[PDB]
Amino acid sequence: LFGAIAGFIEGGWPGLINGWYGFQHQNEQGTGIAADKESTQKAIDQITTKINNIIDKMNGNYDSIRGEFNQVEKRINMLADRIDDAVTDIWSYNAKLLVLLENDKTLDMHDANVKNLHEQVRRELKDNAIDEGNGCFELLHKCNDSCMETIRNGTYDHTEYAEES
Amino acid sequence: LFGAIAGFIEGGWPGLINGWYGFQHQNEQGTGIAADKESTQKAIDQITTKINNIIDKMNGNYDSIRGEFNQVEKRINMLADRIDDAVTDIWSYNAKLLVLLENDKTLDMHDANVKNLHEQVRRELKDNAIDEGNGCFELLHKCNDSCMETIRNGTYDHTEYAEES
Amino acid sequence: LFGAIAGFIEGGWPGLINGWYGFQHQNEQGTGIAADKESTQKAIDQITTKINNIIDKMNGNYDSIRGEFNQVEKRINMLADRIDDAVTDIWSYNAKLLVLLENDKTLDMHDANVKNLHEQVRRELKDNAIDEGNGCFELLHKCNDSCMETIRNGTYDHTEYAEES
Amino acid sequence: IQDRICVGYLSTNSSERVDTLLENGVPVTSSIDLIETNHTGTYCSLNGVSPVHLGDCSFEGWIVGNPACTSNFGIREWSYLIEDPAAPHGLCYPGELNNNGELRHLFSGIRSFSRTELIPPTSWGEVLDGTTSACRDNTGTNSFYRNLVWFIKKNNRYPVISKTYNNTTGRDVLVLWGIHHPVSVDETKTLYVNSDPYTLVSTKSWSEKYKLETGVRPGYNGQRSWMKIYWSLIHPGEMITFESNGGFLAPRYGYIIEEYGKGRIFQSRIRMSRCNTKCQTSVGGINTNRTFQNIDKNALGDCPKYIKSGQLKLATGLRNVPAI
Amino acid sequence: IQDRICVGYLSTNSSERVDTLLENGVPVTSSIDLIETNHTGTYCSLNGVSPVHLGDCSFEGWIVGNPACTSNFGIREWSYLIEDPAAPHGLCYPGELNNNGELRHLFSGIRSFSRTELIPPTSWGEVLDGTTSACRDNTGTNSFYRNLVWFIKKNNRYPVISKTYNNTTGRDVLVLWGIHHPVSVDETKTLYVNSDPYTLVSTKSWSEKYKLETGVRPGYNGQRSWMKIYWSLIHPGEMITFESNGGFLAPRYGYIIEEYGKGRIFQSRIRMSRCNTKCQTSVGGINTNRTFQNIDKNALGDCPKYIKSGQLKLATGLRNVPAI
Amino acid sequence: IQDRICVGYLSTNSSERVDTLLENGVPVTSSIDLIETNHTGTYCSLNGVSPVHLGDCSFEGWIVGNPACTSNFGIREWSYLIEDPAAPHGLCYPGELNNNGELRHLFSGIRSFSRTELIPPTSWGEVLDGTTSACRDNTGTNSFYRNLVWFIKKNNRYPVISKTYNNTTGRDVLVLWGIHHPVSVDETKTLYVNSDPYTLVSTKSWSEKYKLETGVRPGYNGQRSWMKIYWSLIHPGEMITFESNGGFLAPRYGYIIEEYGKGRIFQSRIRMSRCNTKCQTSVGGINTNRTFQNIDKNALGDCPKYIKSGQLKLATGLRNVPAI
Ligand SMILES: CC(=O)N[C@@H]1[C@@H](O)[C@H](O[C@@H]2O[C@H](CO)[C@H](O)[C@H](O[C@]3(C(=O)O)C[C@H](O)[C@@H](NC(C)=O)[C@H]([C@H](O)[C@H](O)CO)O3)[C@H]2O)[C@@H](CO)O[C@H]1O
Ligand SMILES: CC(=O)N[C@H]1[C@H]([C@H](O)[C@H](O)CO)O[C@@](O[C@@H]2[C@@H](O)[C@H](O)O[C@H](CO)[C@@H]2O)(C(=O)O)C[C@@H]1O
Ligand SMILES: *[C@@H]1O[C@H](CO)[C@@H](O)[C@H](O)[C@H]1NC(C)=O
């Protein structure tokens, strides 16, 4: 766990459209919610690859292990069923555990993603902002709607603002 | 690995009672060791759920795959044993590997927990303390026994002290 | 993921000899590339233990499940083959998935290692350097070739330089 | 106040919940199902190949050609068989099919099937064709198994008849023959003339000699003697010879088979249908891209693995934590 | 100095160590064991159901009713069987039990068992009951198998005897019969009068005719002839008829069985006991909530999976790193 | 500018790629292969033990001692068998080996093997040794199976011969005997004198009586009668007696065997060689420390597990991300 989701950023955003992670801004001229297509799409590709691997890699033969027997060959019939059952018990346990393990890793991945996004913004601003320790950054200078966009797209240059701080 | 346990906090605390993680304080009036029931209990619930899943999910039939044979049916008898053995080899490898993988994840989880606890305290204090980079925080103002408790329980407000720093 | 490799440190170093992680320095008197034997060797031991476990733990019997049959015992012959096949399908899926899961964890481990190395240097310097947010640290004082070495070997004392900053 | 920018994540209206290794019932923004729980509830074609319903006949009666069964003359292939456990028709004449377990297994599913005439029914020599009231045909006339011919004495004499079959088909061929055991040495005399008759069946790998086992059986359908029907798979290039002087049910029709034992004999009382799936169970057809299923352990074809489990939800979204 | 607050974690006095995928022998504050290594070392009741010790008898001798064995008249159920590999008693009279492998398998464990009289021993007709010095009873008197009756000539005549059994129990019924092969045509004449006797056994699905195979066997105990004992499971609503004029060991007692083949025939020389477990091994009983075990691969019941491994420690605590 | 120190990681010149659960084709600095893909392409010794090539003989002809085969007199042990599917030689005289499937399985691999003389060929009594043009030896002289002796009438009389074998070897012993079924009662009279001859084979656990089944078979090699060869494993301390008055192929040589059924009968047309591996496949030998292999499902010995997969690369290095 990376302490972001349900962590220092203590709540989600309803009305975050077409994205898992994103930004919420507020300058003199409005608000102020947009998804981060970069990190969201990258996470979507990972979840998709995960799901596809889990399923596409199961390309063997999985129907019953059974034959036809008359009522005089009970023993061989019982062993055949016991083996089928044993094979079924192996897959059963693996399926339950894989899903538990994978759900564990999926949630933590998302946690890591929003945490790496938060750290990415923090590195951009440097001394041009105060870290409020809850996902928000208080700018020390004024930020255009064009300024906000440079912060969102990772191009924001801290040198071009140093003094108003 | 999250670099906390056996990392920048280089040692455990013997005499940390009823807890895995906690705090050690020292003000003018004593010391100064208490477990963090919040994060400790949460970790205990996770380890418990883990253990329970690993064990409770094994609800199939696991006794021998074997039948009764006379001395004239050696072949069928040998196949039955070979299959029992093969099924046993599958479970053997999975058991050894699951435990190795899970121990790996359990230790790292604890590492993550004390690191998220350390970061939580660091966010509380902000500029009211110096981070010594070894798990300790040097307060810039004076801290009551009541002050320490607000730091421990996450309610410490950095605004109510800003000036003595 | 820990946001270091292919993260805030956006590129690798060709010509990093005998190591996975390391340092690149530049003072008045040259440059300036050395592996960190400590963290590199520790990572090498982990990868080696991982590989050895994955392989050494497979110590059962893995040749075919099959017997000899004449052309009059087709059914028992077909079941024997179906069981052999089923056992093979279990190992096939586990092998593919284990490698995918392990590659996932191996890359992230490396990511965590260089991130813990970066954090280790950042803790050493404290206020004696500016964090450039790309793996580099700009020293505020002058650093001997002997100074650089104390930073690399973890002994650098921030008190012995505080003033030139 | 000042200008501010915040980082955040998705929240939604869901009761959707997944279990993780460390936690039960964790709210998530999205998830998928790994286990297939829906089926057609009917017998379907399997990957383009239709099954074969046996109607009111058991497999035994079907394979020997019980006149009351529908003929298998026009069949070319089947993916699986549908059989009624309480089927009224089987071996109409009191008897047993030898090693029927193996046979059932080998005829569970066959990709290439066609009946063929091994030896001409009249090419045997001086003998008559015997019928019985136990094996009446669609009309009501006395008859016998389509695949066998009940040879009896002609003009008070039963000659030593001997024909042989040559597997020239290039594929495996199922041959059926039988031995009739009369109620007494008196009936074998009435039917075959010769005392203590015999049948000799041989290939170049094995050879069986059959003698009659007279006695009264507590049979069915009027008769009280006993028939034992045997079979053998003749491989391409192999030949089987039959020699007899009585009590012999001669092979007429055999089966040319390729890629067999690929099926299943379902006995489930569910209905057949026009659907087509890649996986058939004793409970219904399954069409899904999912790789697991918890519907029925008895399944055939390109199936998801059956597992003993409730639905398993794979998390795709993130933890659903309500808005501040 | 100033006021200070520190974050830290647990350390203890432990040599407790676990292996992880990346590291061997890592100190931890706590751990648990996954593999069960402790057992009772005795035979126990299995989930409330007591086993059945065969004493000095082999399973063969037990099932046919060797007079030297303790009777199975009062048994109702067993979870498994305990047999001595070198048991002195078996088929007291020189003979063999046909298809005893299958039978052993089917009688390894049975949830519902009760002996029953199929056909009254005197309801057969004009024949005597033969005993032998090979099958002496408790006392020392000549006797025979409890479940079979050795019919012989009465007043210099052996009539064609014929009885039939009707499975009305609603459950499966095991029937046992036998064929005695005398040392010579002279002895079969002395014992059964008729030359070349026969036995005819039939159901509505199969029919066997048995003839005598005379000759001197290198037997055991006094005798030098040979007995072949057969068996068959009669299903609810089925009937089996026996007809003979000599050399026939008639069925007296059969077994009514339900939920069978659920057991194991242990041959381990360990002691029986008053304990009760959910898992029995050839080495002792196992009572644990753990899901793995490395004690014995021969195990029966609600058992942990046997695995080839030393103890496996699951970490619960954190890394145990000594105090600064 | 100032003094500066940077943290970084390795980059290299590699097209090396691995797949992870979350990503396909990820560049890495180093990796290893889990699956073995290389083999010798030949038959090798298996863990120090050489196999046994059967040359031009089938296993059947080899085991009974077809004079045209190379003798197995000097063999001590084999890891597996090499057999030509279209081998010209087998049972030279028209016949069948009973239960040859089981036998093949038991002789697939044996750690301790040695031929032995059970009963002296002349210790039987007043009978001659019969040969045939169907079983010619290396020279061209008429002969017979090495392991059996075809007893016939001597001086117009065939006495009741009877010998017995005692298993004193302390190991399991394979015994072979046979029954010859002449073309007619006329030939059995010519060969054995006695009408309706018999052979009685017995141990203290079972007993079989064989009678002759006369008739003309569509055989091969010029003969038209039929031979049925039987076998049995005599356990340490057990004894088997043979009694006959005609039509009997007596046991001469048997086999002392220990640790058997440990092999495989490969029928692959690949070459034998001086190499030695720990794993043999029907395609070649495998010597590797890897635990997986995708070469051939048919494998024997200390083998990597066969799996249905392309090469699997395990990442060892880190993500290979180009220099800034
Ligand atoms: C009081 C009296 O005399 N009643 C006769 C009555 O016997 C007779 O019926 C015949 O009875 C005989 C045995 O007694 C057979 O059961 C005859 O039936 C069958 C059958 O239909 O299967 C006749 C059939 O044609 C036969 N088939 C062949 C190839 O021979 C079989 C066959 O022989 C046996 O099954 C083999 O064991 O017998 C039955 O007709 C009637 C009519 O004849 O007349 C009464 O007066
Ligand atoms: C039912 C019966 O006849 N019991 C006989 C028994 C059988 O007749 C015999 O086993 C048939 O094979 O024979 C017994 O006793 C006699 C011996 O003591 C004697 O040595 O040899 C006799 C024949 O030559 C016969 O074996 C026996 O087991 O007690 C007599 C018994 O009543
Ligand atoms: C049919 O069998 C006979 C046996 O006499 C053989 O000669 C012939 O070649 C076989 N048919 C073909 C087309 O091979």
Residue E191 and residue E96 share a domain? yes
One domain for residues F263 and F282: no
Can you read off the two tokens belonging to residue B9?
């906090």
Determine the straight-line distance between the first and last CA of chain D, rounded to whole angstroms.
20
> What is the distance of C-alpha E163 from the center of its chain?
29
**Cα–ligand 1 centroid distance for D14 (angstroms):** 79
Angle at C112 between CA C108 and CA C113, to 5 degrees: 115
Structure-block tokens of residue E188: 């079969």
Domain boundary among D270, D299, D314: D270
A neighbour chains, 3+ CB pairs within 8 Å? B, C, D, E, F
Question: Which residue among E251, E270, E289 closes a domain?
Answer: E270
Residue E175 phi/psi, 5-degree rounding, is -110, 135
CB contact under 8 A, A53 and C100: yes
For residue F297 the two structure tokens come to 């499902």
Is the torsion defined by CA of B108, B110, B114, B119 positive or negative? positive
- Breaks in chain B (C–N > 2.5 Å) following residue: none
| In F247-307, beta strands by DSSP E | 248-251, 253-260, 265-266, 272-277, 279-281, 285-286, 292-293, 299-301, 305-306
CATH number of the structural domain spanning residue A160: 3.90.20.10
Peptide bond into B32 cis (omega under 30): yes
Name the closest residue on chain A to residue D3, using Cα atoms: A27
The 3 state secondary structure assigned to chain D is CCCEEEEEEECCCCCCEECCCCCCCEEECCEEECEECCCCCEEEEECCECCEECCCECHHHHHHCCCCCCCCCCCCCECCEECCCCCCECCCCCEEECCHHHHHHHCCCEEEEEEEECCCCCCCCCCEEECEEEEECCCCCEECCCCEEEEECCCCCCCCEEEEEECCCCCEEEEEEEEEECCCHHHHHHHHCCCCCEEEEECCCCEEEEECCCCCCCCCCCCCCEEEEEEEEECCCCEEEEEECCCEEEECEEEEEEEECCCCEECCCCEEEEEEECEEECCCEECCCCCEECCCCCEEECCCEECCCCCCEEECCCECCCCC
From chain B residues 50-109, the ones with a CB under 8 A of any chain D CB are 50, 53, 59-60, 109
D218 vs B13: CA distance, rounded Å: 88
CB distance F303 to F11 below 8 Å: no
Q: Which ligand 2 atom is the nearest neighbour of the CA of E152?
A: 1
Q: Which amino acid is at D277?
A: T
Q: In angstroms, what is the C-alpha Rg of chain C?
A: 26
Q: How far apart are CA A143 and CA D13, in angstroms?
A: 33
Compute the distance between CA of residue F56 and CA of residue F47 in angstroms, rounded to an integer.
26
C-alpha C95/C-alpha C62 separation (Å) is 14
Cα gap E176→E72, rounded to integer Å: 15
To 10 degrees, the CA torsion angle through D13, D19, D22, D24?
A: 80
Residue where a domain terminates, one of E270, E294, E311: E270
Those residues whose C-beta lies under 8 Å from the C-beta of residue F57, and which sit 6 or more positions away, are F66, F68, F69, F70, F87, F89, F90
Tokens of E104: 């052993």
Q: What is the DSSP string of C136-149?
A: EEEESS---HHHHH
Tell which phi-psi region holds residue B84, choosing left (phi > 0), alpha (psi between -120 and 50) or beta.
Answer: alpha
A139 forms bridges with which residues in the sheet?
A129
Q: What is the resolution of this structure in A?
A: 2.6
How far is the CA of E164 from the CAs of A114, E237, E239, E240, in angstroms? 82, 13, 7, 6
DSSP class of residue F93?
Answer: S
CA distances from D296 to D272, D306, D307 (A): 18, 7, 9
Domain of residue A8, residue span: 1-165
- How many other C-beta atoms can be found within 10 angstroms of the C-beta atom of residue E269? 10
Protein residue with its CA nearest to atom 8 in ligand 3 = D166
C24: left (phi over 0), alpha (psi -120 to 50) or beta: beta
Class of residue F251 by CB neighbours under 10 A (exposed 0-12, middle 13-18, buried 19+): buried
What radius of gyration do chain F's Cα atoms show?
29
Distance in Å, alpha carbon of C121 to nearest chain B alpha carbon: 11
Residues E44 and E99 in one domain: no
What are residue F77's phi and psi, to 5 degrees? 180, 150
CA distance E74 to C156: 88
Which member of C2, C83, C96 has the closest CB to residue A65? C83
Q: How far is the CA of D175 from the centre of ligand 2 (A)?
A: 49
Helix (H) or strand (E) holding B26: strand B21-26
**Ligand 1 site, residue D150, Cβ cutoff 6 A:** yes
> Is the same domain home to E168 and E251?
yes
Helix (H, G, I), strand (E, B) or coil at F258: strand
Alpha-carbon span D54 to D70, nearest angstrom: 8
Shortest distance between the Cα of B71 and any Cα of chain C, in A, equals 17
Secondary structure, 3-state, chain E: CCCEEEEEEECCCCCCEECCCCCCCEEECCEEECEECCCCCCEEEECCECCEECCCECHHHHHHCCCCCCCCCCCCCECCEECCCCCCECCCCCEEECCHHHHHHHCCCEEEEEEEECCCCCCCCCCEEECEEEEECCCCCEECCCCEEEEECECCECCCEEEEEECCCCCEEEEEEEEEECCCHHHHHHHHCCCCCEEEEECCCCEEEEECCCCCCCCCCCCCCEEEEEEEEECCCCEEEEEECCCEEEECEEEEEEEECCCCEECCCCCEEEEEECEEECCCEECCCCCEECCCCCEEECCCEECCCCCCEEECCCECCCCC
Same domain? For D256 and D314 the reply is no
Phi-psi region of D19 (alpha: psi -120 to 50; beta: other; left: phi over 0): beta
How far is ligand 1, taken at its centre, from the CA of residue D222, in Å?
Answer: 9
Q: Which residue type is seen at F216?
A: V
Interface of D with F in 300-319 (CB under 8 A): none
Helix (H, G, I), strand (E, B), or coil: what is residue B135? Answer: coil
Contact F195, F230 (CB under 8 A): no
CA-based radius of gyration for chain A: 26
Radius of gyration over alpha carbons of chain E, in Å? 29
Annotate C69-100 with b (16+ C-beta within 10 A) or e (fewer): bbebbbbbbbbbebbbbbbbbbbbbbbbbbbb
Helix (H) or strand (E) holding F150: strand F148-152
How many Å lie between the alpha carbon of D173 and the closest alpha carbon of chain F? 19
Whole-number Å distance between alpha carbons of F140 and F134: 11
Q: Would you call E164 and D218 a contact, using CB atoms and an 8 Å cutoff? A: yes
Q: Which tokens in the block code for residue A18?
A: 């077409």
Instruction: Test E219 with F206 for CB contact under 8 angstroms.
Output: no
Chains C, F: CB pairs < 8 Å: 205
Q: Is the dihedral of CA B70, B74, B79, B83 positive or negative?
A: positive
Q: Which residues contact E201 (CB under 8 A, 6 or more apart)?
A: E177, E207, E208, E209, E210, E230, E240, E241, E242, E243
Contact of F117 with F65, CB cutoff 8 Å: no
CA distance F247 to F188: 7
Q: Assess F183–D contact: CB distance below 8 Å, yes or no.
A: no
Q: Pocket of ligand 2, candidates E133, E183, E220: which has the most ligand atoms within 8 Å of its Cβ, to mutate?
A: E133
Are C141 and C161 a contacting pair, CB within 8 Å? yes
F257 and F211 in a common domain: yes
Distance of CA B104 from the midpoint of ligand 2 (Å): 76
**Smallest Cα–Cα separation from F145: which of F159, F134, F156, F158?**
F134
Q: Burial letters for D54-72: b for 16+ Cβ neighbours within 10 Å, e otherwise?
A: bebbbbbbbbbbbbbbbeb
Experimentally, how was this structure solved? X-ray
Give the residue carrying structure tokens 């012995």.
Answer: C160
How far is ligand 2, taken at its centre, from the CA of residue E223, in Å? 7
Residue with the two structure tokens 């997986």: F292
Indicate if the alpha-carbon torsion angle F88, F93, F99, F103 is positive or negative.
negative
Residues F164 and F31 in one domain: no
Residue in the structure block whose two tokens are 């057992």: E39
Tokens of E172: 């499966």
Q: F194 and F246: one domain?
A: yes
Amino acid at F137: D
**Domain shared by F183 and F302, yes or no:** no
DSSP three-state, residue B21: strand
In chain C, how many domains are there?
Answer: 1
- Which CATH number goes with the domain that contains F245? 3.90.209.20
Please say whether the beta carbons of C26 and C19 come within 8 A.
no
HSE-CB of A80 using CA atoms within 13 angstroms? 21
Three-state secondary structure call for residue B107: helix
In the DSSP assignment, the letter for residue F165 is E
Do residues D119 and D246 both lie within one domain? Answer: yes
- Indicate if the alpha-carbon torsion angle E186, E188, E191, E192 is positive or negative: negative
Who among A87, A112, A126 is closest to C1 (CB)?
A: A112
**Residues C141-145: contacts with CB within 8 Å, 24+ apart?**
C141/C165, C141/F3, C142/C27, C142/C28, C142/F3, C143/C25, C143/C27, C143/F3, C143/F5, C144/C27, C145/C27, C145/C29, C145/C30
Q: Which chain F residues are within 8 Å of E216, Cβ to Cβ?
A: 200, 243
Contact C106, F320 (CB under 8 A): no
Are the C-beta atoms of residues D151 and D127 closer than 8 Å to each other?
A: yes
CATH number at residue E306: 2.10.77.10
Ligand 2 in reach of E143 Cβ (< 6 A): no
Paired residues of D227 in beta bridges = D95, D180
SS3 label, residue B163:
helix
How many beta-carbon pairs under 8 angstroms link C with D? 14
- Residue in E311, E269, E282 with CA at minimum distance from that of residue E294: E311
For ligand 3, whether the C-beta of D239 sits within 6 Å is yes
E238 contact D CB<8A: no
The 8-class DSSP code of residue F71 comes to P
Ligand 1 within 6 A of D214 CB?
no
Choose the residue to mutate in D119, D164, D166 for probing ligand 3, maximizing ligand atoms within 8 Å of C-beta: D166
3-state secondary structure of C71: coil
How many domains is chain E built from?
Answer: 2
Residues E89 and E10 in one domain: no
Of the candidates D292, D253, D231, the one whose C-alpha atom is nearest the C-alpha of residue D97 is: D231
Residue D125, CA atoms < 13 Å, CB-side half-sphere: 15
The Cα–Cα gap between F40 and D97 comes to 49
Inter-helix orientation angle A74-125/B74-125, to 10°: 20
Q: In A, which residues are within 8 Å of F24 by CB distance?
A: 49
Cα separation, D142 vs A13, in Å, equals 84
Do F172 and F178 form a contact (C-beta atoms < 8 A)? no
- D76/chain A closest Cα distance in angstroms: 21
User: Phi and psi of E292, rounded to 5°?
Assistant: -130, 160
> Containing domain of residue E70, as a range?
50-270
Look-up of token digits 């010879």: D241
Alpha helix locations (H) across B5-141? 37-56, 74-125
Distance from the CA of D236 to the center of ligand 3, in angstroms?
Answer: 11
Signed CA dihedral, F56, F58, F63, F66: sign only: negative
D58 lines ligand 1 (CB under 6 A): no
- F274 touches F48 (CB < 8 A): no
Q: Tell me how far the alpha carbon of residue D122 lies from the centroid of ligand 1, in angstroms.
A: 25
Tell me which chain C residues have a C-beta less than 8 angstroms from the C-beta of D261: 74-75, 78
